[PDB]
Design a protein around this ligand. Structure first.
Ligand code: ITD
Ligand code: ITD
Lengths: 426, 428
């Protein structure tokens, strides 16, 4: 004995039908709106449509799940294998696409050359789509239609419990453990690496030890002067006066930033006194004010004041027009690498020319974190359900409620298909 | 329903013990105190040796058990089991890390190489290997009959769970890491061009040269323009497709070949340079073309005595004459290489930088290739017996016992993987 659920034959078909409509409309929109019209697309937005294709592929099989619940399984043997294969493919792909999104996001922040084009355009197939299909061979073989309880039951029939043990471990590892670690690794490094200081760290360079400037003068950090003396020990004492701790050579990056802020305060005060630069600076925004400071740090205030027409256009909010003027200048002729990045900051009013953290880029990353967590949040209650009864085998009274919740939680977990389209909305 | 190794296995255990202990002991004593020539591969090769020395030390217990009984008790039974598990997972993951190092060194020479060897090696390889040794602690116990030491699981389900974990973590997961690193290195591993890349430097992106014109690659001029509008125009036509200001090595070499052709045609029309050029060998002709890109045919033609010396094949005389010149005084690094190319007639001046990097690649290749060849007969053996557990082979107990006999011979013979790394230091 202990080899009947009234409520689950009204809950499950409603939940499947709901996810089916929301999935087919939601995702199908993603597929049509990006798939075709969209021309400026992100690396995340490329994986999000790859993910949308995967979630659409599964939602299409949902009508079969609803019929199999309320009534018999009429669809035959091939469709039993096909419905099992699509679910397998979806399970593996959806999570490992999220692994590629978190992996790409790592290379976007921590490594701002570009081996990301390889990932999104050619690795994604070899690494995600082909293995997901190869992982469907035991679902092609074992899934069959059988007569049980004056009905046709469609599931995977294994010859032994050792096979059940083989495939359950392969699913826990490949489906959840293996990408979960990859996903955690990327975000652990991202949050470890995580504005104006960073800009001048790239442009003027950072040195955490006393060096000889190009005109014979002792400096430390981003060209911060200590004293006016050709000796070595006289400048070493001047550091402790500002820093407040004994160093004897080596200084940290955060003590340096302290000296850098003292020089930015100085650059601002000087700009505010210079009659030509003062009105334009006040009209500019924090991002663009930081670009003007980059120039002032370079050739001085008199040099930046020399760009007459460029200044008025910046106040007149003409970024596109003031851009070509600085390319003809002596500043572009000398150092063209630094010059172009400063003009791009004036052009866009963003930290994009400097790459990684910035404003729009943080929001773009927050979007990626929400999606990944919400995906795990869907599957989480069901995992405890595998886990509780996954080890079982107290009594039949409690075992009836366990297997009941595993049906509900898997059905509610399918909301992960509706996550990506809902996230794009508003 | 199934109802020589007692002498042969301890012979293999003894051979692998003596070669292992001595070899790894030497690697630890020598490379442990060698601060001079320390190489990145040698840094992981010390971990691999420590992992293999810890295992070779437990082999006298393995030999004793096989012939006569387990005298060592319950504690040592767990210790020999854990060390075998530690050596099994770590040795391969060290080779997997060595494969990542070769990728990071060849694909792009940031510095994540020092972080892997000095700090990611413990958290990535040693900590997980000890975490994976926990089931072997709780399951290994000694039973009676004779005393038998092995892992005793409650049923066959536990046996299958760990057998799949061992196949996946021990073979599948690092095997992919190793193959992937290598198919990437082989991919991005495709003369005079590389000689001038070391000298002048390659640039895929558009750059103003020191003087105002627009240039791309290795000294390939386009035209005179006040803005980006006319620079890309001459580039896009010469390539044969849309560039958008970007090109690869395929296109850049095709531009370099044109500039070499113009230089060669220019050298041939010159009355001073042509007899010298024709007399010179392939490698030395490329050394002369190098001088033409730096100074110009007119400049190279100035070096009268030096040219006639090359024309007369008086190599050493021409090498000192070019070293005692303003060209050498101004650019010592480039000149010395070009001079030594004219002196030796070999690529050595340039392919003695990438000779220790190329040697490291081969050593790694042999070390990895030998490791899997050592485990290949054992993998074949287990695969056959894996299907015996899952019920495919139509054979009796005569063949079912023959495989278990051969699985033990191949396991003992696989241990030789502890001896590959030290033997490679002696031969290579
Ligand atoms: C893990 C898995 C894919 C396996 N499975 C199962 C077992 S098959 C199955 N119906 C469907 C599951 C999904 C594929 C189509 C059959 N059985 C019963 C038969 C009695 C009446 C209720 C449903 C139910 S939900 C679930 N999820
Ligand atoms: C895979 C494994 C670690 C497991 N195993 C086995 C099975 S346990 C075992 N004792 C050895 C296991 C390995 C450590 C030393 C004892 N059996 C017998 C006991 C009677 C004499 C022959 C071996 C043989 S060789 C081997 N290697």
């Amino acid at each position: 004995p202990c080899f009947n659920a009234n409520f689950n034959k009204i809950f499950l078909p409603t939940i499947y039908s709901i996810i089916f409509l929301t999935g087919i409309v939601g995702n199908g929109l993603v597929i049509l709106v990006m798939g075709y019209q969209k021309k400026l697309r992100s690396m995340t937005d490329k994986y999000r449509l790859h993910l949308s294709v995967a979630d659409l592929l599964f939602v299409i099989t949902l009508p079969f799940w609803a019929v199999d619940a309320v009534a018999n399984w009429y669809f035959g043997n091939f469709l039993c294998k096909a419905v099992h294969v699509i679910y397998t493919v979806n399970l593996y792909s959806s999570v490992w696409i999220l692994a590629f999104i978190s992996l790409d996001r790592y290379l976007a922040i921590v490594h701002a050359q570009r081996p990301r084009k390889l990932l999104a355009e050619k690795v994604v197939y070899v690494g995600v789509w082909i293995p997901a299909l190869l992982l469907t061979i035991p679902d092609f073989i074992f899934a069959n239609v059988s007569e049980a309880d004056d009905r046709y039951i469609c599931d995977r029939f294994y010859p032994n419990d050792l096979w059940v043990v083989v495939f359950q471990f392969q699913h826990i590892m490949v489906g959840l453990i293996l990408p979960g670690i990859v996903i955690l690794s990327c975000y652990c490094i991202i949050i470890s690496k995580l504005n104006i200081f960073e800009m001048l760290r790239i442009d003027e360079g950072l040195r955490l030890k006393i060096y000889k400037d190009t005109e014979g003068y002792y400096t430390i950090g981003i060209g911060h002067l200590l004293t006016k003396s050709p000796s070595l020990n006289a400048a070493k004492s001047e550091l402790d006066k500002a820093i407040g701790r004994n160093t004897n050579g080596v200084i940290t990056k955060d003590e340096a930033e302290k000296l850098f802020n003292q020089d930015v305060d100085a650059a601002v005060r000087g700009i505010l006194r210079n009659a030509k630069l003062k009105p334009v600076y006040d009209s500019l925004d924090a991002v663009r004010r930081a670009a003007l400071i980059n120039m002032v740090f370079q050739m001085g205030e008199t040099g930046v004041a020399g760009f007459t027409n460029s200044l008025r256009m910046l106040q007149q909010k003409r970024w596109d027009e003031a851009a070509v003027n600085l390319a003809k200048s002596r500043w572009y002729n000398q150092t063209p690498n630094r010059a172009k990045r400063v003009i791009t900051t004036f052009r866009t009013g963003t930290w994009d020319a400097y790459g990684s953290k910035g404003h729009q880029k943080r929001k773009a990353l927050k979007t990626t974190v929400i999606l990944i967590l919400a995906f795990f949040a869907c599957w989480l209650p069901y995992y405890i359900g595998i886990s509780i009864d996954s080890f079982i085998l107290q009594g039949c009274e409690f075992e009836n409620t366990v297997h009941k919740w595993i049906s509900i939680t898997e059905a509610l977990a399918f909301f992960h298909c509706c996550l990506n389209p809902i996230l794009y909305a508003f």
